[PDB]
Amino acid sequence: QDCGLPPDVPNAQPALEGRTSFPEDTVITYKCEESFVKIPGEKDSVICLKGSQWSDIEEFCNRSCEVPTRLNSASLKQPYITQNYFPVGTVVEYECRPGYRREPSLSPKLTCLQNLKWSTAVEFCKKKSCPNPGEIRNGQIDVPGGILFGATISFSCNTGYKLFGSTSSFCLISGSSVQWSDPLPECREIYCPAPPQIDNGIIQGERDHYGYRQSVTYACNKGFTMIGEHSIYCTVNNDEGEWSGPPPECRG
């Protein structure tokens, strides 16, 4: 009263695991072979009946494509998102991921060819472009690889200016769109320390501030003689301002 090995079903292999004798009421499920998927709603199993007789079963496996190809730009739409049965002719549709945008000129759909291969995918979903980085007063924005989603940009300040803020920004996905990670930094003028006053001399047209390359010219009072260069200059190595040298001196 024990059934032998289940019948032979084309493109399917019964899950014995790993018996030989199956007691009555024993339900054996068949699994479709590679490149085959069970046709929905069809009998895929048998059962040991009275008389050591297995129930009846017939071909339930049709040729089908592998689960659609995973793409970075687009995700599958329902119900394809949970389907496994893709008989030749099956057409699936994708929906742009975040943050990508649809390309009007192309189909977000794929077709299951006769060779069980999904049709070549195009760029139906492209990277969303980030806002124009803008401009940094007395600074520069380095765009090494565009400004689209995932892009990075670095910042720098021209000579004589110190950078205040982030040195870079990434085009990350922000809510409903792609947004720069960090805001534009600031390039603030580097100022030299107050020029030195000298004994018996003055500074001609003294100023409030002194930035890179600006200068101060001294003048000895009446009766005194200048010893040294008349002027010094604000040098700005290295994000800190410093006078070129020492002020002249006035000998009476």
Added chain:
Amino acid sequence: MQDCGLPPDVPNAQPALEGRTSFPEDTVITYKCEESFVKIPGEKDSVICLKGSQWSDIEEFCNRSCEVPTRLNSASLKQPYITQNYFPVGTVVEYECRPGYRREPSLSPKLTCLQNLKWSTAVEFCKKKSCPNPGEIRNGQIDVPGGILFGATISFSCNTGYKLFGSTSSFCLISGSSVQWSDPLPECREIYCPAPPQIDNGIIQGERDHYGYRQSVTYACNKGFTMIGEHSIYCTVNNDEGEWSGPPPECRG
């Protein structure tokens, strides 16, 4: 004889012989005041050989006197002191201002011959004339090391990003009736960078006619092109010649 011998001795005077030893009648000999002495005007300074081998009568005619007034750069002598040589002790000479100096009213332009036959110490009665205010230089500076009086000097320079055109210095010279700066104020032109470079498959945003120190040019890539590099470049002006900070960006298709 009919002939005289050596003329008589005169204090502070030495007769111009010479080196004659005999003098025929009518011969006239003049005496010459010794050092520190000058002949008193309207006074007989010579003798003649009279009959009887006798020299005419002569009396002291030399008075002590200071030398010719001191030479000054500020002032010169007025008339008639200008041509005078007779400066008895206690004599006062007046000076007038030279070009280009001016009078210091509170100061005496007069000098006096002291007992030791020297000139009274002079004072600054003739001051140096001032020069007009140098003024200013647009985008430049004027270095005035030692005032703006007669003989003064000033130099010129341009601010970062500008180039001096003209004189580099100016002297306060005497011009006709006063003192005037030898050279006019130079000009501080503006260094322009060479026209920015055009880039393949890209454009320059809001291109300008001229770019000066620090001015920036923004680049933009055409449709379907990718930017690889800096977004903008600026004009750097080392060193009286302008040059772009770096290379423009690439617009990769």
